[PDB]
Design an enzyme around this catalytic site. Structure first.
Site, PDB file in Angstrom:
ATOM      1  N   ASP A  86       0.829  -1.206   0.000  1.00  0.00           N
ATOM      2  CA  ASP A  86       0.000   0.000   0.000  1.00  0.00           C
ATOM      3  C   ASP A  86       0.864   1.256   0.000  1.00  0.00           C
ATOM      4  O   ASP A  86       1.362   1.654   1.062  1.00  0.00           O
ATOM      5  CB  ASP A  86      -0.914   0.012   1.236  1.00  0.00           C
ATOM      6  CG  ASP A  86      -1.827   1.234   1.294  1.00  0.00           C
ATOM      7  OD1 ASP A  86      -1.935   1.948   0.280  1.00  0.00           O
ATOM      8  OD2 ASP A  86      -2.436   1.452   2.371  1.00  0.00           O
ATOM      9  N   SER A 144      -0.747  15.622 -11.990  1.00  0.00           N
ATOM     10  CA  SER A 144      -1.001  15.232 -13.364  1.00  0.00           C
ATOM     11  C   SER A 144      -1.244  16.470 -14.224  1.00  0.00           C
ATOM     12  O   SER A 144      -1.770  17.457 -13.753  1.00  0.00           O
ATOM     13  CB  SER A 144      -2.207  14.287 -13.453  1.00  0.00           C
ATOM     14  OG  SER A 144      -2.589  14.090 -14.802  1.00  0.00           O
TER      15      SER A 144
END
Length: 330
Positions: free
Chosen positions: A35, A199
């Site tokens: 994770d 992004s």
């Protein structure tokens, strides 16, 4: 040194991925959920409330000649999906795909919430975010990656998640045969303890690319792709019959649909998520309403590049003095 381990979907929807991990002496192999959105390595154990264990493999520290109780240490964590667990702490030998850390904090669960109990395939988590998020008290502990870093050939690990198929976690090296073209690297903020990056935009299907900054985290521990409501609305508008359902808890769509791809930007580069990756199947057994793999982050407080996104790429988690993230197509 290096390590290399196969990671395997837990079910036919890729709801999560498990990777075998050797703990203790002799080895006790547990299948953990790697994770990059948390920083605790915790396991089902001989100390876990018996009614809260249902099929998981447990760590028994009394059977490990290298286990030592970390005196006074406790841990307690809550995840973004509302699940939680807590317990005490041992240090022991932990190996992943041939890579060994001695004195790793192994957090032994005394309590787990129902969703962990109900998932027989996951024996615990292995956190790979920054150690600043580790919950051990009163002495915060380091992640497996943090402990291994200095020994690694290169201070990196890579995530290569499969679509409906096994993939690979590598430590200490970049497998140049595992991706196409080049790797595009992008800046990371560690201020929130996450692999947080920005992004450069998105496209829906064969649509034109929208240049727009989307801050979010690379999180292998989250199944879906969580993005701003504007973005998510633009995507699902291209699917006939798709709708946001408050009763179901997100966007659903007719199971008869062919989903469009979703592209996200990494610098000037582009990662394409095929439409099939965005189908998470009937909302309930036998239903013709299917759950979407792209959902709104509104009310999470953060955008999450979860498995839906990451499995479309070869992802480099670069733990150099100034961390960065790399993405390549594959």
């Amino acid at each position: 040194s290096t390590g290399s381990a196969t990671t395997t979907p837990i079910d036919s929807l890729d709801d999560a991925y498990i990777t075998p991990v050797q703990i203790g002496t002799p080895a006790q192999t547990l299948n953990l959920d790697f994770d990059t959105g948390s920083s605790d390595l915790w396991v089902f154990s001989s100390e876990t409330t018996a009614s809260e264990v249902d099929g998981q493999t447990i760590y028994t520290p009394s059977k490990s000649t290298t286990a030592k109780l970390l005196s006074g240490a406790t841990w307690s964590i809550s995840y973004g999906d509302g699940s939680s667990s807590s317990g005490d702490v041992y240090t022991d030998t932990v190996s992943v795909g041939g890579l060994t850390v001695t004195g790793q904090a192994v957090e032994s669960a005394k309590k787990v919430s129902s969703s962990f109990t109900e998932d027989s395939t996951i024996d615990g988590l292995l956190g790979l975010a920054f150690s600043t998020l580790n919950t051990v008290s009163p002495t915060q502990q380091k992640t497996f990656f943090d402990n291994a870093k200095a020994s690694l050939d290169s201070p990196v690990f890579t995530a290569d998640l499969g679509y409906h198929a096994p993939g690979t976690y590598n430590f200490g090296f970049i497998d140049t045969t595992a991706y196409t073209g080049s790797i595009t690297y992008t800046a990371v903020s560690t201020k929130q303890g996450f692999w947080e990056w920005t992004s450069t935009g998105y496209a829906v299907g064969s649509g034109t690319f929208k240049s727009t900054s989307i801050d979010g985290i690379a999180d292998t521990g989250t199944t879906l792709l969580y993005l701003p409501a504007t973005v998510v609305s633009a995507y699902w508008a291209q699917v006939s019959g798709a709708k946001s359902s408050s009763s179901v808890g997100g966007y659903v769509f007719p199971c008869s649909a062919t989903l469009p791809s979703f592209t996200f930007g990494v610098g000037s580069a582009r990662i394409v998520i095929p439409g099939d990756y965005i189908d998470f199947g009937p909302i309930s057994t036998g239903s013709s309403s299917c759950f979407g793999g792209i959902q709104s982050s509104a009310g999470i407080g953060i955008n999450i590049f979860g498995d839906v996104a990451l499995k479309a790429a070869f992802v480099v988690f670069n733990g150099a003095t100034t961390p960065t993230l790399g993405f390549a197509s594959k």
